[PDB]
Amino acid sequence: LYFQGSLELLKLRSAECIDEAAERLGALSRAIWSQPELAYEEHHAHRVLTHFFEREPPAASWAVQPHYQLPTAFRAEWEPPEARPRPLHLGFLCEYDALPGIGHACGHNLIAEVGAAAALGVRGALEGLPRPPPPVKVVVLGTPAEEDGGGKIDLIEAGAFTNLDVVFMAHPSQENAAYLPDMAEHDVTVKYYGKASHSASYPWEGLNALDAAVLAYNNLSVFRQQMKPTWRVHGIIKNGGVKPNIIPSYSELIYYFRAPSMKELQVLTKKAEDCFRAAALASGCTVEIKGGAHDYYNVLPNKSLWKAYMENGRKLGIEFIGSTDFGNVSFVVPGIHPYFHIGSNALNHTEQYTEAAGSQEAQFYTLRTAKALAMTALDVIFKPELLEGIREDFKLKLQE
Amino acid sequence: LYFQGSLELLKLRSAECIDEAAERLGALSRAIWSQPELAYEEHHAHRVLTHFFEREPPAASWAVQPHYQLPTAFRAEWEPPEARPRPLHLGFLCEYDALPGIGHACGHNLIAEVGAAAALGVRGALEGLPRPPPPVKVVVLGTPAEEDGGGKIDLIEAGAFTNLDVVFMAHPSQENAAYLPDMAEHDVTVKYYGKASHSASYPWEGLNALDAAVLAYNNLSVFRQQMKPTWRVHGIIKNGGVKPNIIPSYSELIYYFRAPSMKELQVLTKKAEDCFRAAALASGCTVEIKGGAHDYYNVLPNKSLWKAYMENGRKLGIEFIGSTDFGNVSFVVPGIHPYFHIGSNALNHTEQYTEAAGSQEAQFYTLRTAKALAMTALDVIFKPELLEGIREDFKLKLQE
Amino acid sequence: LYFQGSLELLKLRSAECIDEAAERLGALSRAIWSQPELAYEEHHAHRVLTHFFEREPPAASWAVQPHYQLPTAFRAEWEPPEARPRPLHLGFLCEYDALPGIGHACGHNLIAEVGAAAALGVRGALEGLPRPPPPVKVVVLGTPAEEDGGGKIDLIEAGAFTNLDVVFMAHPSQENAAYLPDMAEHDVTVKYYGKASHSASYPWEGLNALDAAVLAYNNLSVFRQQMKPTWRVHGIIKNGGVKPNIIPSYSELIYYFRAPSMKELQVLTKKAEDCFRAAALASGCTVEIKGGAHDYYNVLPNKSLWKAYMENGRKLGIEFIGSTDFGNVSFVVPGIHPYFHIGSNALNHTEQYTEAAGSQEAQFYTLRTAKALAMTALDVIFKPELLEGIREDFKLKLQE
Amino acid sequence: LYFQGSLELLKLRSAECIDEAAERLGALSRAIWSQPELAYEEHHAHRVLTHFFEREPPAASWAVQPHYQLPTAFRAEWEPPEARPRPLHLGFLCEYDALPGIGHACGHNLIAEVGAAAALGVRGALEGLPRPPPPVKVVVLGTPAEEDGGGKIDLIEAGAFTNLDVVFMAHPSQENAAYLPDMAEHDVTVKYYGKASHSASYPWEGLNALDAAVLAYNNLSVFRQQMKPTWRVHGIIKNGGVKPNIIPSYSELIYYFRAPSMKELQVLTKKAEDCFRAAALASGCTVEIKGGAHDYYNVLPNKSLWKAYMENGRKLGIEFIGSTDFGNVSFVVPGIHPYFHIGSNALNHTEQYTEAAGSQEAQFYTLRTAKALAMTALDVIFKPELLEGIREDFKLKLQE
Ligand SMILES: [Zn+2]
Ligand SMILES: [Zn+2]
Ligand SMILES: [Zn+2]
Ligand SMILES: [Zn+2]
Ligand SMILES: [Zn+2]
Ligand SMILES: [Zn+2]
Ligand SMILES: [Zn+2]
Ligand SMILES: [Zn+2]
């Protein structure tokens, strides 16, 4: 309430701090939105974001590590100037890679903005405290290459998440939801090797790798009837031959599989493997099945963090109702990944979403959800009961 | 020529003997044609043919063994009443099984007739000899179940062909040819076993044996592009499920494969096996691949017997241009299997061929080809140079 | 409460009446369970149920019409002996057809029991009223052939539902739910006509109707990737040829399609039709696509009836969380179709569910849900606000 | 015989003239073989061959038209310096385009050589005549782009063949045959157009053009069972999608069809068209079926020219036993297209055939067949009975 320095006042201060930074946060958005960059090539975005935190006053009060483990990833940290337990480490993630051809059709410029905004708001609320604040470290991580590769996984492998206690990010969508079901994903490239022959003269001396590709497609297609409705299989024939006068000796398929858990994903992947090896057996070709570098995990929900986020969203006026490398993060750190409406009916990964992601209209919705994240971070800092419940829900759901 | 008892006179006598028997030979044809019987059920045909040879005058001069190794097979033998090398054993085959639904749509009634006629003609020509005839045994074998099962193979397994020196038969067709390419054949029944489930509720708990059948079909179909043009693959889905509400747990396919040699047939069969096992692997079903009881061999040509037959056919006015268990015979005894026109344009295995096979018109053509066979048998008896050349061509072509 | 003759007392009386009838209700269950009968052949079940209502005391107080529009359907009615608006007509449905081979693996014996029990309970509660009861007619309809054919649709076509105001039934399942999503369904038989030919000699003169069946299967299979996850396609190749020596001239497929609305079902059906006609075009065959006699509709929910049912279920101790011809009923009369747990983990349409459906354990759960239905019927009788809300929700959801 | 200037002496003189030119003919071969060029890009070959005929002594005695209708085609003519019926026009064809990657793997350098050699030999035999020679025009046509495009067809369209009476060429192969069955050919490019959608979110909003490609492949594959054994279908999936996250909206197939006559080719092409349009219908895509620029015709045999060629080949020591745009020529001018062994077991269109085509060993065989062609041209010049029989066989076989 209106008490000396209540939690409510700290939440208000975080909101006022985000409002105060609205103009430079929107410039941050537009600098990324207007210069879209693909996975692992976000050199401009990396420049913009590192400069953003280096310039936050007082300059150098954010400790900024550019080129953190990846050339376009960065890390930025702030903690109250204090000294003598263990400090609470709260992480905020920024995404900023675009999509080929259509630009920021997933609003990743606003994910960068919302992670920066929420971290500014937590710092400003903690600087507004008179008595020494509890020991907290605000950590911002720039995570490149969400659409391809999975920069958070590169960062997990580097140990970047091993000391975080809770991690926050949010994603622009078509409605406001504290959690939506993101699924595990496994990528594969399938290559078939046969034996060239002149189809005009001696076709029976060939081993037809195009046949292998089509049979694999047929094999997977009838299998769809026995997939679970939550399972997904999608793929293309990237190479299906070069000229009709030669029985093709090479073919190449590229496929994705998705399922709501890793146990199901491995069942689905094994059935697909059988389908690919069947096509080799039937055609007389050999086959190479090369899995992707980084399987994406499903996102593990956190009930306690979920409820505390929705309560803050309600106060802010928020009404509530694929796959991401945030799933891998959520398996090693309790986290939340809310989706938020930005005033558009367009769907993600379409050109009209690129328009909405860059719009002035989206800015209000983006800063509002950033306020919700910061208030929730303040919840975790000042409610030890919540932190333990968060940890309890994290340990329990990990039993899977 | 007009010499004492030249070979030419003996050939004339065999022709006159067949002409003399034309009425009872045609009654033999009509008795089988008018009462068609299927493989291994030719009880009436077996009765007709055994009675035919028992009644040839003088009665019992043909030594007749009814129910010879098979209930509807028979054996009939005649040799000149003589005594003291090795006698020449010349075999003549009678077929007499019909086709389901359409009756004697392959003219098998005329194969019975032509084998009987040729054997009568050889005996009559040898009885016309004054001086003691060379030692010869005329052997007639009734071989049931040509269209299904392969009665000649049952008879080979019983040893019926191990003492024959040359074997003759002929087959009504659409033109006169001393030899046509009959191919090796392998039959298979394929059964897939999956796991039933309610497709309405839990289809993903099923293993779909109908899928296996369709994938095998697809696998074989793309393979056609790499078959040799002489290869043949034909098959049906005999069982493809029972009701749509249950994921089928059983499916059944029936296939035939044909190739011009046993070496090629085994290559084709192995590629098909891969196709069937691929469908099991892709679908999660198990599979049973049960080969037929009797593979049919291709028919081995005999150049020497071929040329001597055509020379006799020319003198008679004959102008010259699938798979059968005669192929298996031709691998163990030098033989010929000429095809003969019967005055019809109809194709074998059609209803109009049943009409032609029963027609009065066909009788002239049938007796004419029987004359050609008997004259050729007389060639082998009285030309030791031909017998050795026949044996030479048989040993040489067996190198395969 | 404990008031003169409150609604609560009437609900208690309906429960006590069902308890009083428990022994004869269970005998009714066992008489159907132990003599399973298939769609339109439920002659014993029809005898059992008509006799049940004719024997309810005082005898003939239920007005019973055997052989009502269908040989095994029946209608039974009771109303308070009263006289001088419009009477409320409340319908209760009894199902009683079994499944081939496995008997009452859907618990339809308990659907018969629960519809009878609920109607007895409403009558007993209304006979317990001192002052004249409001004008109500309790209607029981025996609806045969739910698993195949759709007896409720036969009955709709006869006008049986045109004067009902609300209709009640319940279905044994694996949990207690006031509503579960039953989908629209369309059945089709597909027949392909080609041209026979001897595959041994002239396969190129055939038009292969087995090919048509396999291509249709392939066409539908790749289409699965673009179906909605709620859509269902299931089918078998009932006839796929007869013998491999003849290019098949006939093939036959049987398929079901399901979608959550009639608009979606027609989209799905049209895409399938394209798949079937494509297979004819590719193969050179003609095709006949014969839709089923009775499309099943999805079940239209009724929010008001839903909430009033759950409130009664809670008081009774009930804890809450395919396609049926009840969907067609729910499009013409406001209705509910709750599912209820019967003390088993077995799934419907399995043999172990037949065991549970016949068990003594199931009887407690069956009578409890019948109590819930009767109390809800009493809700509609004595709450005009509920009746209008029920009608409002019915008109609104019909806008689809 | 040894008569004044018999035909035999003229044939000998043509052989001696070819022997005299062997060194420069082999240089001609090596100049093309060592600098392989593809269809319509044979600028060096065109330079070599035009220069060859311009340099034949006396210089300019061959009337040479470079860049004749096509940039790399040429025409060269010689006739006896004479004057006052109609002159006999005899054509000789030179091919000279190579194959991508493997060079002159069809020996086209030797087709150029053999057509040049035969024309030199006819001229030299006619210059050796004392009395005025009959009026003859020796025409050499360079026909580019045999492997792709069909330069003879470009030349037919320009009228180049309308005044020729007989046309000669020969093709290096694996044995010596006066005629081998070259088939009619039709090329098609098939493009499918669907509707992109995000397969991750809304795959059911896509229309899958990759599905169309696979279904067309399936459609054609089952059709193989009903093709004639002489028919050929071969094709590739040139474009089968770009990335798995987007339902492909475009696919592209490239196919060839071959049959022994134009009537059969059109039947085969129509059945394939049905297969392509079926895939569009099943998938919801539209389709464009674009036939090739130039259908190749089968080669029409000429019995009279055939027999006269073989008789000359025998005297020379020659022992006798796909598709080409020479087929289109043979439909408008009586011609022959013998194949000749060149001392190699390698197959055409393989790298080892490129070795043989360039070998010193091949030169003897090439000049020998050129001698046979020239002698046959002398046959036509000096046997009016042969010319009429040639024309008779040409008119008769055109009835097709
Ligand atoms: Zn995205
Ligand atoms: Zn995203
Ligand atoms: Zn037959
Ligand atoms: Zn036969
Ligand atoms: Zn049921
Ligand atoms: Zn049911
Ligand atoms: Zn070539
Ligand atoms: Zn060539």
Short mmCIF file of C-alpha atoms in Angstrom, two decimals, chain A residues 126-374:
data_model
loop_
_atom_site.label_atom_id
_atom_site.label_comp_id
_atom_site.label_asym_id
_atom_site.label_seq_id
_atom_site.Cartn_x
_atom_site.Cartn_y
_atom_site.Cartn_z
CA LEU A 126 16.08 -1.18 -6.53
CA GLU A 127 17.91 2.16 -6.72
CA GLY A 128 14.78 3.76 -5.24
CA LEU A 129 15.27 1.81 -2.02
CA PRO A 130 16.57 3.80 0.98
CA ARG A 131 17.85 1.05 3.25
CA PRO A 132 20.36 -1.35 1.66
CA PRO A 133 18.59 -3.50 -0.93
CA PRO A 134 18.81 -7.28 -0.65
CA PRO A 135 21.71 -8.75 -2.62
CA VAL A 136 20.54 -9.16 -6.21
CA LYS A 137 22.35 -9.27 -9.54
CA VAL A 138 20.38 -8.23 -12.63
CA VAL A 139 21.81 -10.16 -15.62
CA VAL A 140 20.89 -9.40 -19.25
CA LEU A 141 21.97 -11.95 -21.87
CA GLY A 142 21.76 -11.30 -25.58
CA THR A 143 20.87 -14.66 -27.14
CA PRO A 144 21.37 -14.63 -30.93
CA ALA A 145 20.11 -17.13 -33.49
CA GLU A 146 16.75 -18.20 -32.08
CA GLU A 147 15.26 -18.93 -35.51
CA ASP A 148 18.14 -21.18 -36.57
CA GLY A 149 20.93 -22.74 -34.54
CA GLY A 150 19.78 -21.85 -31.03
CA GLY A 151 22.04 -19.28 -29.41
CA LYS A 152 20.71 -19.98 -25.92
CA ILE A 153 22.03 -23.53 -26.29
CA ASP A 154 25.47 -22.28 -27.28
CA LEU A 155 25.22 -20.16 -24.15
CA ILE A 156 24.06 -23.05 -21.96
CA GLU A 157 27.06 -25.06 -23.17
CA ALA A 158 29.31 -22.17 -22.13
CA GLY A 159 27.83 -22.22 -18.63
CA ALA A 160 26.05 -18.88 -18.97
CA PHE A 161 22.93 -20.09 -17.18
CA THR A 162 24.47 -22.14 -14.37
CA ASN A 163 24.38 -19.29 -11.80
CA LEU A 164 20.97 -17.80 -12.66
CA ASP A 165 18.13 -18.31 -10.22
CA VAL A 166 15.22 -17.19 -12.43
CA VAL A 167 15.11 -16.09 -16.05
CA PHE A 168 12.58 -13.82 -17.76
CA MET A 169 11.69 -13.03 -21.36
CA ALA A 170 8.53 -12.40 -23.37
CA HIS A 171 7.47 -12.85 -26.98
CA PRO A 172 5.03 -10.79 -29.08
CA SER A 173 2.16 -12.87 -30.43
CA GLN A 174 -1.61 -12.52 -31.11
CA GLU A 175 -2.89 -12.65 -27.52
CA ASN A 176 -1.72 -12.29 -23.93
CA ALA A 177 -0.82 -15.62 -22.33
CA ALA A 178 1.48 -16.33 -19.39
CA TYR A 179 2.43 -19.64 -21.05
CA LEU A 180 1.82 -21.32 -24.42
CA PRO A 181 2.83 -24.90 -25.36
CA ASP A 182 6.17 -24.82 -27.17
CA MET A 183 7.31 -28.28 -28.22
CA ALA A 184 10.55 -30.19 -28.45
CA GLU A 185 12.14 -30.18 -31.92
CA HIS A 186 14.65 -32.38 -33.75
CA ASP A 187 16.03 -31.57 -37.22
CA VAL A 188 17.47 -34.11 -39.63
CA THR A 189 19.12 -34.06 -43.04
CA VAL A 190 18.68 -37.32 -44.96
CA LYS A 191 20.94 -38.18 -47.90
CA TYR A 192 20.48 -41.24 -50.14
CA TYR A 193 23.28 -42.73 -52.24
CA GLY A 194 22.50 -44.94 -55.22
CA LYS A 195 24.19 -45.85 -58.49
CA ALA A 196 24.01 -43.74 -61.63
CA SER A 197 23.06 -45.39 -64.90
CA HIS A 198 21.78 -44.27 -68.29
CA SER A 199 18.01 -44.54 -67.91
CA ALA A 200 17.73 -44.60 -71.72
CA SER A 201 19.86 -47.74 -72.16
CA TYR A 202 20.48 -49.55 -68.84
CA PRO A 203 18.07 -48.24 -66.18
CA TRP A 204 18.07 -51.67 -64.48
CA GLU A 205 21.76 -51.12 -63.66
CA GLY A 206 20.91 -48.10 -61.53
CA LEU A 207 19.95 -47.78 -57.88
CA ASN A 208 17.49 -44.94 -57.78
CA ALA A 209 18.04 -42.45 -54.94
CA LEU A 210 15.07 -40.39 -56.11
CA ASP A 211 12.95 -43.49 -55.51
CA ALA A 212 14.40 -43.62 -51.98
CA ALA A 213 13.31 -40.02 -51.37
CA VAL A 214 9.76 -40.65 -52.61
CA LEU A 215 9.41 -43.91 -50.67
CA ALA A 216 10.58 -42.20 -47.46
CA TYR A 217 7.97 -39.52 -48.12
CA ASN A 218 5.32 -42.22 -48.63
CA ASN A 219 6.50 -44.08 -45.52
CA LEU A 220 6.21 -40.98 -43.34
CA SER A 221 2.88 -39.98 -44.93
CA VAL A 222 0.98 -43.15 -44.04
CA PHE A 223 2.57 -42.91 -40.58
CA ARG A 224 0.73 -39.61 -40.00
CA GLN A 225 -2.43 -41.61 -39.29
CA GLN A 226 -0.69 -43.10 -36.25
CA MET A 227 0.96 -39.91 -34.99
CA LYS A 228 -0.43 -38.20 -31.92
CA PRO A 229 -2.37 -35.03 -32.79
CA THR A 230 0.28 -32.99 -30.95
CA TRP A 231 3.08 -34.46 -33.09
CA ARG A 232 4.42 -32.65 -36.15
CA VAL A 233 6.40 -33.84 -39.16
CA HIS A 234 7.40 -31.47 -41.96
CA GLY A 235 9.97 -31.83 -44.68
CA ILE A 236 11.10 -31.11 -48.22
CA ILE A 237 12.95 -32.92 -50.98
CA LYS A 238 15.85 -30.50 -51.33
CA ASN A 239 17.60 -32.55 -54.03
CA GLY A 240 15.58 -34.91 -56.22
CA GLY A 241 17.79 -35.41 -59.24
CA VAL A 242 19.49 -33.28 -61.88
CA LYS A 243 18.55 -34.59 -65.32
CA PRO A 244 16.06 -37.24 -66.48
CA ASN A 245 18.55 -39.11 -68.69
CA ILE A 246 20.50 -40.40 -65.65
CA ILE A 247 18.97 -42.52 -62.87
CA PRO A 248 19.66 -40.21 -59.88
CA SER A 249 22.47 -41.46 -57.64
CA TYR A 250 21.90 -38.86 -54.89
CA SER A 251 18.88 -37.42 -53.11
CA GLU A 252 18.50 -35.19 -50.08
CA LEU A 253 15.61 -34.55 -47.73
CA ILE A 254 15.34 -32.11 -44.84
CA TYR A 255 12.84 -32.73 -42.04
CA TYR A 256 11.73 -31.37 -38.68
CA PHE A 257 9.90 -33.33 -35.97
CA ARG A 258 8.10 -31.85 -32.99
CA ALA A 259 6.48 -33.40 -29.93
CA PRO A 260 5.44 -31.98 -26.54
CA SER A 261 8.14 -33.88 -24.57
CA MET A 262 11.59 -35.33 -25.16
CA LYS A 263 10.32 -38.85 -24.50
CA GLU A 264 7.73 -38.46 -27.26
CA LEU A 265 10.18 -36.74 -29.60
CA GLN A 266 12.53 -39.73 -29.39
CA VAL A 267 9.67 -42.14 -30.17
CA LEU A 268 8.69 -39.99 -33.16
CA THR A 269 12.31 -39.68 -34.31
CA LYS A 270 12.84 -43.44 -34.12
CA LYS A 271 9.71 -44.15 -36.19
CA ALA A 272 10.94 -41.64 -38.77
CA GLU A 273 14.38 -43.25 -38.78
CA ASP A 274 12.70 -46.58 -39.57
CA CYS A 275 10.91 -44.80 -42.43
CA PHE A 276 14.17 -43.44 -43.83
CA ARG A 277 16.01 -46.75 -43.49
CA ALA A 278 13.06 -48.56 -45.08
CA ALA A 279 13.40 -46.37 -48.16
CA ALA A 280 17.08 -47.30 -48.44
CA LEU A 281 16.30 -50.99 -48.04
CA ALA A 282 13.54 -50.91 -50.66
CA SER A 283 15.61 -48.95 -53.19
CA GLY A 284 19.03 -50.54 -52.72
CA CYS A 285 20.52 -47.20 -51.69
CA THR A 286 22.53 -46.43 -48.60
CA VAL A 287 21.42 -43.59 -46.33
CA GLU A 288 22.95 -41.06 -43.94
CA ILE A 289 20.65 -39.63 -41.25
CA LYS A 290 22.33 -36.58 -39.70
CA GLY A 291 20.54 -35.03 -36.75
CA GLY A 292 20.66 -31.32 -36.11
CA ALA A 293 23.26 -29.69 -33.90
CA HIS A 294 20.83 -28.56 -31.21
CA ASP A 295 17.57 -30.26 -30.30
CA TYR A 296 15.19 -27.67 -28.84
CA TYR A 297 13.47 -28.73 -25.62
CA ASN A 298 9.87 -28.05 -24.73
CA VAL A 299 9.33 -25.15 -22.32
CA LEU A 300 8.88 -26.32 -18.75
CA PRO A 301 6.10 -24.34 -17.02
CA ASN A 302 6.58 -22.87 -13.56
CA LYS A 303 3.23 -22.64 -11.77
CA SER A 304 4.37 -20.24 -9.03
CA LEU A 305 6.09 -17.82 -11.40
CA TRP A 306 3.08 -18.15 -13.73
CA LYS A 307 0.58 -17.06 -11.06
CA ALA A 308 2.69 -14.16 -9.79
CA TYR A 309 3.14 -12.91 -13.36
CA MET A 310 -0.59 -13.03 -14.14
CA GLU A 311 -1.43 -11.13 -10.94
CA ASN A 312 0.90 -8.32 -12.01
CA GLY A 313 -0.47 -8.41 -15.55
CA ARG A 314 -4.03 -8.02 -14.27
CA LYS A 315 -3.06 -4.92 -12.29
CA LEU A 316 -1.51 -3.53 -15.49
CA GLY A 317 -4.70 -4.16 -17.48
CA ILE A 318 -3.59 -7.29 -19.33
CA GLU A 319 -6.37 -9.75 -20.13
CA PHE A 320 -5.26 -13.37 -20.54
CA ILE A 321 -6.73 -16.37 -22.33
CA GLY A 322 6.19 -23.79 -32.32
CA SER A 323 9.50 -24.40 -30.55
CA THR A 324 12.20 -22.21 -29.02
CA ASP A 325 15.63 -22.67 -27.52
CA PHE A 326 14.15 -21.07 -24.42
CA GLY A 327 12.89 -24.61 -23.78
CA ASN A 328 16.48 -25.71 -23.10
CA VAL A 329 16.93 -22.77 -20.71
CA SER A 330 13.72 -23.67 -18.83
CA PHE A 331 15.18 -27.14 -18.18
CA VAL A 332 18.18 -25.65 -16.35
CA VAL A 333 16.75 -22.42 -14.77
CA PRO A 334 13.18 -21.70 -13.58
CA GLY A 335 11.80 -19.30 -16.15
CA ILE A 336 8.77 -17.78 -17.81
CA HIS A 337 8.17 -16.92 -21.46
CA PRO A 338 4.85 -15.03 -21.70
CA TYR A 339 3.37 -14.13 -25.07
CA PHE A 340 1.81 -10.70 -25.53
CA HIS A 341 -0.60 -9.13 -28.01
CA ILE A 342 0.75 -6.04 -29.78
CA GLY A 343 -2.42 -4.59 -31.30
CA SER A 344 -2.41 -6.67 -34.48
CA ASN A 345 -4.34 -9.62 -35.89
CA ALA A 346 -1.42 -10.60 -38.13
CA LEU A 347 0.19 -13.97 -37.52
CA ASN A 348 3.84 -14.43 -36.62
CA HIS A 349 6.19 -15.26 -39.50
CA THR A 350 4.12 -13.25 -42.01
CA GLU A 351 4.98 -9.93 -43.66
CA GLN A 352 2.13 -8.13 -41.91
CA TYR A 353 3.65 -9.15 -38.59
CA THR A 354 6.86 -7.36 -39.62
CA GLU A 355 4.67 -4.24 -40.04
CA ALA A 356 3.10 -4.67 -36.61
CA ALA A 357 6.46 -5.43 -34.97
CA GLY A 358 7.77 -2.08 -36.23
CA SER A 359 4.63 -0.10 -35.52
CA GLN A 360 4.21 2.70 -33.01
CA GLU A 361 1.12 0.83 -31.72
CA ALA A 362 3.23 -2.14 -30.58
CA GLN A 363 5.30 0.04 -28.24
CA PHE A 364 2.57 0.48 -25.62
CA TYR A 365 1.97 -3.27 -25.46
CA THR A 366 5.69 -4.02 -25.32
CA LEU A 367 6.44 -1.66 -22.44
CA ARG A 368 3.36 -2.90 -20.56
CA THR A 369 4.54 -6.50 -20.64
CA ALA A 370 8.04 -5.37 -19.65
CA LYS A 371 6.44 -3.75 -16.59
CA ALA A 372 4.78 -7.06 -15.77
CA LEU A 373 8.11 -8.91 -15.99
CA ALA A 374 9.92 -6.40 -13.76
#
